[PDB]
């Protein structure tokens, strides 16, 4: 099937002991390199929150509800990063634009002190 | 007394990672967040292997870093942790070793040009 691609936006089961526990299925962005995304059992993701619609700290990237088929105008939290078993990935909502992915890269560099 | 010395990028802490624990981890988040944020970002350290197996791995030797055995930093295994989960500071990485972690983190996260 279609490879998980860096920059894709997925619904992901973040519920601890996920199975089908609660409403812990939230949008995330794939930030892992595409070689791991193709062969690894795991991916690395950044959280997306609708709790805010405006960047509050330098690790935030805003994303529009309409273009990216979200339930709210949201923010990518590059300070909230986690490695995820691929079995926790549900549906693929969309993918970020190349310009939007560049904002994510820059915020990732800030977040992890990579300059 | 809880040491007010600030958490720094490259520090090696013992951390409570349950659930998927207490294991060593490397702080990889920027030092401004490390000073003020409720959370840090860490990469896992494992003694299950003693040699880099994939390009996201960085080896660290037991004696230099006060480890129970030769270990590997897994830059494919990243997690954001509440600071409460950090226990004791074990040690911190050399400048060259940290440069290797940066490189493996750029590979892991697809940031290299």
């Amino acid at each position, epitope marked *: 099937q279609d490879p998980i691609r860096r920059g894709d936006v997925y619904l992901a089961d973040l519920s601890p002991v996920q199975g089908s526990e609660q409403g812990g299925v939230r949008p995330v962005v794939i930030i892992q390199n595409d070689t791991g995304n193709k062969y690894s059992p795991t991916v690395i993701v950044a959280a997306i929150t609708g*709790r*805010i619609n*405006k*960047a*509050k*700290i*330098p690790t*935030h990237v805003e994303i529009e509800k309409k273009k990216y088929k979200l339930d709210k105008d949201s923010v990518i939290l590059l*300070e909230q990063i986690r490695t995820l078993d691929k079995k926790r990935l549900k549906e693929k909502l969309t993918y970020l634009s190349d310009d939007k992915m560049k904002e994510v890269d820059n915020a990732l560099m800030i977040s992890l002190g990579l300059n | 007394h809880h040491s007010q010395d600030p958490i720094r990028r490259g520090d090696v802490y013992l951390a409570d990672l349950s659930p998927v624990g207490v294991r060593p981890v490397v702080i990889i988040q920027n030092d*401004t*967040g490390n*000073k*003020y*944020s*409720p959370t840090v970002i860490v990469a896992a350290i494992t003694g299950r292997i003693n040699k880099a197996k994939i390009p996201t791995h960085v080896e660290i030797e037991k004696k230099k870093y006060k480890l129970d055995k030769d270990s590997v930093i897994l830059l494919e295994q990243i997690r954001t942790l*509440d*600071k*409460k989960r950090l226990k004791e500071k074990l040690t911190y990485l050399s400048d060259d070793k940290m440069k290797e972690v940066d490189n493996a983190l750029m590979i892991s996260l697809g940031l290299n040009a």
Partner: nanobody, 124 residues
Framework: QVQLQESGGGLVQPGGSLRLSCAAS????????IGWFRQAPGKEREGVLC????????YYADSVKGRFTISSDNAKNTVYLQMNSLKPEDTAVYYC?????????????????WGQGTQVTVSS
């Protein structure tokens, strides 16, 4: 919704003290990020004392460390900026700001709520 209002500014002599209050016309500062800013004519607005999460650490501008501290009342509807050892460089309009997203740290790039500002003037 809410509307923040600063008070307690005014004129003080060098070395003097001043307590600014930031009162919330609607909410309590529970689980709210809180920032204190100042803006002097000709100068850029400057974050002076900012709290994101209570599980984080307070940010202080270098120039105010040791002199400015924050505290809140019992009702948690009032936060105070205690300003001691005031200097002529501290003259400015002072603003409080708050935001419901209390998962960050430092002075935020954006706050949902701002005050109108209160003037602080340190003159001899």
């Amino acid at each position: 919704q809410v509307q923040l209002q600063e008070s307690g500014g005014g004129l003080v002599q060098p070395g003097g003290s001043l307590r600014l209050s930031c009162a919330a016309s609607g909410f309590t500062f529970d689980n709210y990020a809180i920032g204190w800013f100042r803006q002097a004519p000709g100068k850029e607005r400057e974050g002076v004392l900012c709290i994101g999460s209570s599980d984080g650490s307070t940010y202080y501008a270098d120039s105010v460390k040791g002199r400015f501290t924050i505290s809140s009342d019992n009702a948690k509807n009032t936060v105070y900026l205690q300003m001691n050892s005031l200097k002529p460089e501290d003259t400015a309009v002072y603003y409080c700001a708050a935001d419901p997203w209390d998962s960050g740290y430092g002075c935020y790039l954006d706050y949902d709520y701002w005050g109108q500002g209160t003037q602080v003037t340190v003159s001899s």
